Structure formats: structure tokens, C-alpha cells
Amino acid sequence: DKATIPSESPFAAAEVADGAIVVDIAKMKYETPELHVKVGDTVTWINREAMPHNVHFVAGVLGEAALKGPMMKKEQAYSLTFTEAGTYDYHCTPHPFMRGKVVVE
């Protein structure tokens, strides 16, 4: 695969250490649409509003199968560690208009 999952289920945002790579979700959008990280970094998405959101990578992007991430409720987080360089696009399952990408270098 192109990434590993630290936590299969969402976890409390408060557990995200200061200084960690974070993409906040609020107002129906990924606050950082074009995130640039290095091979090996772990990205953590934190939903900041009541509206549930998740990250969804279609099949073939992070691996054979698509990665339909779990829905984060307010103050919940989800992480993904990228093990290979490249550009991986994603969107929010119920809100296709919500799109973002992670550039692994």
C-alpha cells in the first residue's frame, strides 16, 4: 500500500500532540486543501464542526482497494501514515464537493 492506518477508528482530537501534521475540517471544507508532507509523515484530520466528515480515497490511490475512512464527529480525529511519495487526492464521502490532496515528497 501507499499508506498505513495508525487508528482504524476515530479518536479524541485532544490526543493529537502539539506539532503534528494536521488538516482541520470546518465550514464544509478541508482547511488545508493541498498538504505537502515527507515520505513517512503521518497526517491527522480533525473535524471541528458538528457536521460529520471523513476522508475518502478511491480505489487505486493508496492501494488496490479504496480507503473509505470512518466518519469523524466533532472533535474526532483520523490519521494516515504515507509510506510512498506521490500525490493522493481525496474527498468526503457524503460531501463530494469537499476535496483535498496530500503531496508526499
Binding site: A50, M51, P52, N54, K68, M71, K73, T93, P94, H95
Partner: protein, 125 residues
């Protein structure tokens, strides 16, 4: 009762269409086919995604965001049908549209509609 009259929520019977958490439900109440207010019936698949709506709770005067997830992989239950549209928006604003079959994320890729649950996912405005 009058179908066109303003919606009047109650907090004493979840199988009635005027139960407060169903302010924007479309389909059938899961509690009527083996599920519960917030759980899917045996044999069905629980969707992760859904449309939402802010529902007013007459008991505590607070408004809560309800995530209308569907239980799928079964033909419509046919029991306890309801259709409310408090704050429901057209399809070009999917996050609040309820004609959409919210089965995405369900196990086994089940996409058939069986019933809808009314769990609270947070407080609203």
C-alpha cells in the same frame, strides 16, 4: 392531522412521525423492523455517511444535529413510514438533502434502503 401545518415535535414516542429526532427523516423508522432509535435491525448493513438536520428538542429546548444514517441491504421495511423536511435542502446541497439513499459506507457495499436511524451527533444552532 394537517400535513401542511407547521411541524410540532414531541418527545414521548419514537415510532410516531412527530418524534423530535425525526424532524428530517425520509423513509421508515428502524425501531419498527427490529432496530432501535439509533441501531440497525439484524441482518442489515449500517451506513457511515448520511444527510443531517438540526432538530429542536421540546424537552430541553436545545437543538441537536441528527445524522440520518440508513440501514441497508434489505427491501424497504414498509413499517412506520415518515417524511419530514425541517431545514431539508435541494440535492445540490446534499449535506441536507433527504431523497438521497444514504447507504454509503455500509458493509458489503449494501445500497438498498431498509430504514433510517436518528442518532444525535452533536448540538446545533
Amino acid at each position: 392531522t394537517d400535513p401542511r401545518a407547521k411541524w410540532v415535535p414531541q418527545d414521548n414516542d419514537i415510532q410516531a412521525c412527530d418524534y423530535w429526532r425525526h424532524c428530517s427523516i425520509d423513509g421508515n423508522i428502524c425501531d419498527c423492523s427490529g432496530g432501535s432509535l439509533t441501531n440497525c435491525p439484524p441482518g442489515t448493513k449500517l451506513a457511515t455517511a448520511s444527510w443531517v438536520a438540526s432538530c429542536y428538542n421540546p424537552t430541553d429546548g436545545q437543538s441537536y444535529l441528527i445524522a440520518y444514517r440508513d440501514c441497508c441491504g434489505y427491501n424497504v421495511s414498509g413499517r412506520c413510514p415518515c417524511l419530514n423536511t425541517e431545514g431539508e435542502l435541494p440535492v445540490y446541497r446534499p449535506e441536507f438533502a433527504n431523497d438521497i439513499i444514504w447507504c454509503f459506507g455500509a458493509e458489503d457495499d449494501a445500497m438498498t434502503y431498509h430504514c433510517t436511524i436518528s442518532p444525535i451527533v452533536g448540538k446545533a444552532s
